Amino acid sequence: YISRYLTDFEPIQCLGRGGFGVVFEAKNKVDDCNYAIKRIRLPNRELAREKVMREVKALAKLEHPGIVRYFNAWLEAPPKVYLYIQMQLCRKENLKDWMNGRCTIEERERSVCLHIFLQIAEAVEFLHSKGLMHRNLKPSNIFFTMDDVVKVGDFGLVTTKLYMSPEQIHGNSYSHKVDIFSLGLILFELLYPFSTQMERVRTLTDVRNLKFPPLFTQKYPCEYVMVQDMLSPSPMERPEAINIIENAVFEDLDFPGKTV
Numbered sequence: 455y456i457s458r459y460l461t462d463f464e465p466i467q468c469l470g471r472g473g474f475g476v477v478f479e480a481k482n483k484v485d486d487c488n489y490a491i492k493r494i495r496l497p498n499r500e501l502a503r504e505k506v507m508r509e510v511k512a513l514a515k516l517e518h519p520g521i522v523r524y525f526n527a528w529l530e531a532p533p534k535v536y537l538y539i540q541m542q543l544c545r546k547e548n549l550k551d552w553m554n555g556r557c558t559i560e561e562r563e564r565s566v567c568l569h570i571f572l573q574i575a576e577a578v579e580f581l582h583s584k585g586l587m588h589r590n591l592k593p594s595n596i597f598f599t600m601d602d603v604v605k606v607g608d609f610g611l612v613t614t615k616l617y618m619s620p621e622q623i624h625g626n627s628y629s630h631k632v633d634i635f636s637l638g639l640i641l642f643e644l645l646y647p648f649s650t651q652m653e654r655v656r657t658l659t660d661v662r663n664l665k666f667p668p669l670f671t672q673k674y675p676c677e678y679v680m681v682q683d684m685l686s687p688s689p690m691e692r693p694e695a696i697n698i699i700e701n702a703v704f705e706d707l708d709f710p711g712k713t714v
């Protein structure tokens with residue numbers, strides 16, 4: 455048996471694992487570029503397999519500055535079936551890591567945080583404009599290109615339900631509005647640095663229930679209102695992504711070092 459993966463690529467390292475998958479960094483021999491390659495073991499469940507095959511076809515159609523860049527997908531059946539998915543390689547440190555390395559207010563300057571958030575919201579608006587949704591938006595699914603461009607995807611590098619809409623937690627039917635709820639908590643978290651995991655969990659749990667730290671409401675009155683709206687228990691009451699991105703807070707964002 456000839457393995458397409460082993461023939462075409464030089465493996466570099468394991469980047470991680472999660473769900474049906476394992477992810478490698480590998481260099482393509484012909485083009486000399488390094489990629490992230492996800493190897494998904496197809497499940498022994500026909501309905502789950504149906505979903506996997508649909509999802510790869512869907513992701514292959516997507517092109518947007520804030521969405522992970524697709525290259526190829528293929529199947530291998532060594533004498534178990536594996537689906538390989540080849541994407542652009544992002545930096546090792548994702549948004550969760552980035553926030554964990556910036557634990558002071560000085561390291562979360564408003565314009566920087568809003569610039570990062572805007573890119574996430576724009577990726578979400580793109581999905582919604584295509585009649586798609588993310589469903590699992592959270593900092594561990596938000597990475598950066600080598601040049602710090604925000605990239606949204608379904609990464610599956612398990613190292614949480616904190617960002618999940620109430621309707622999803624309860625196992626109810628849902629709409630694209632689930633992503634708006636996730637966005638609300640992410641906006642808050644970007645603006646509000648933590649010193650401990652315990653502090654993070656307690657505060658984000660309170661924020662889910664619209665209980666905000668007084669110093670956040672005072673420092674960021676505009677974003678406070680935005681987060682409140684995004685975290686409405688009623689999905690109908692949450693704003694569309696397009697209305698979030700058109701908010702006045704996102705106008706003429708600048709910071710020293712910003713790409714010009």
Ligand SMILES: CNc1ncc2c(F)c(-c3c(C)ccc(C(=O)c4c(-c5ccccc5)n(C)n(-c5ccccc5)c4=O)c3N)ccc2n1
Nearest residue numbers: 477490491492506509513539541543544545546607608609
């Ligand atoms: C440390 N650096 C680094 N860099 C890039 C990575 C990467 F692109 C991925 C990655 C890979 C290799 C493949 C697909 C994705 C991805 O976003 C996926 C996506 C996806 C979801 C939303 C937008 C775009 C893509 N889907 C739908 N799926 C998927 C889900 C269920 C079944 C089958 C496929 C994905 O796997 C991905 N993020 C994983 C880890 C990475 N690590």
